[PDB]
């Protein structure tokens, strides 16, 4: 009963968050073993962030110019390197709280939990989808940079995101933990924008399933459709073209509800062409695309860690 | 930038979650010092839960009939008592992870984070409002009972909720940590229902402020109103009557936006009488009442712990 946007528990990552200061610039860092990971723009003055030469800017920096603080304890920096748009600081101490972990580049459409941090302290936790245009719709204020997104598979933390910037639209962009941006973004204060965002069709269908399961069904019709004719309608609404692989992935939900995917696709086409007429689904007056098929299964199968 | 429903970080509470088995019934418990707290219906067979005599049912139970497990470690139960609808098990070990904590009965309209647990393992974290009818709209499956809701004030965990039941509507009911239900609910499988829910007006206004701040303003009109005439309209829409105290509480937001509360009330009346015409606010096609004025300030003032 109930379907909520749910974040993973944040304890494991909470113990990996530190504060990194370089001059006047303070942001957050991720401490795993004897390496702290942070956005490289920590080394920029306010002037620099219009058109920085990070190679040249780091050349003038030494280990002692990096102030890293865990709680009130200061870590000694004993080496530094730049990997893409992230800085790896080698420290004298390995994090005793280092969890089992992995670094994963995540695919668009996929979800993760974000631990929003300021001054190396956890502020709060929310779940996000990597949007098709490689932006995320988060809540990040200044000081949030170096906050990370993650998944937990039983015991293993899979870090997929580190925060670097907001775009004029008020959306957010960042890197994987190897410092490669998701999307065509660069760490400079220039005119930057993301493409057209698409609705993640596979994720909307899954959310429709979650509804049936929770007892919302008004939207169910008496018709079916064909993938191709469904997508003709998808095109016009900026919904992602649905594939056979998608249909396979929804198979578990289809099975547990006894609703064929293409019957649900017919339901969806009606909502796109007819709206929800003031009616709501799982208490949303719009269609939600930020729930993965798996997110739904887990939440409707009570999976823990 | 961005406004998201945000849960507190769950690390501190994660270390207080245990599994409690009594016969065939397993649910979660909260371990603080040498006391584990759990719902008393753990002592019920499936037959018992239609009309249980908890006094009589506990009389037949001994300390050794309670299996409490932290991780894989079993705790020895050395005493038991029933306080309202919660059981306090005294154990041989005090939780070494016991955080600074408090037990608070929360007021309707107020929010908290829930750590959803199964078999004493954290599954995930979400934020909830205590609704005026003293229900919550959560995601709880069987095994979730003994999961708790909490706030964190810097260092102090303020536990306000423990989960016991779902109602036919698919909403949820539970107790404070002294075992007193919120609302007129009882722990039996009987026909039970909550009253009419009201929209938490103060919280909707705050969310409107959060929007302005994030750049959504279409809804702003060229008029004002009076508390009394606003509420005449509130009445009809099952919105909570707004008070002067409410207006005082929104004062900080009013000030930072330069929008008087009563001008915003005029905006609100138009949306109630005219709808949002397919338009959205902070990407919601409806009005959100599950954000406290404070929740907004914190999220728009980047407060941590
Ligand atoms: C790092 O914490 C900060 C977070 C931004 C600040 C406002 N909301 C956020 O998410 N990011 C930056 O300062 C970033 C630094 C560049 C050198 C990558 N600049 C940026 O995000 O530009 C957009 C911006 C808009 C409004 C205020 C500040 C920055
Ligand atoms: C405790 O984990 C369980 C959680 C319920 C089960 C389904 N969704 C939930 O939140 N609560 C109970 O089992 C509770 C026990 C009574 C003796 C208090 N019974 C209950 O919630 O009745 C309603 C119900 C509806 C549908 C399935 C199961 C129970």
Author numbering:
A (entry chain A), B (entry chain A): 1 to 305
What does the paper say about this structure?
The SARS-CoV-2 main or 3C-like protease (Mpro or 3CLpro) is essential for viral replication and is a promising drug target. As the E166 site appears to be a hot spot for drug resistance from in vitro viral evolution experiments, we solved the structures of two substitution mutants Mpro E166N and Mpro E166R, revealing how E166 mutations may compromise activity versus drug resistance, respectively.
However, the Mpro E166R mutant conferred a growth reduction that matched the wild-type Mpro, suggesting that its catalytic activity was intact. But both nirmatrelvir and GC-376 have the same pyrrolidone side chain placed in the S1 site where E166 is located. The GC-376 complex can thus offer important insights into how E166 mutations may impact the binding of ligands with similar chemical structures, including nirmatrelvir. In contrast, the longer and positively charged R166 side chain in the Mpro E166R mutant does not interact with H163, but rather extends into the solvent. The E166R mutation would abolish this direct HB with the substrate or inhibitor, resulting in the pyrrolidone ring of GC-376 forming an alternative weak HB with F140 backbone carbonyl group (3.1 Å in length) in the mutant complex structure. Consequently, the distance between the N-terminal amine group and the F140 carbonyl group increased from 2.6 Å in the WT to 3.7 Å in the Mpro E166R mutant, diminishing the HB. The crystal structure of E166R with GC-376 revealed loss of key hydrogen bonds with the pyrrolidone ring of GC-376 which can explain the increase in resistance to nirmatrelvir containing the same functional group.
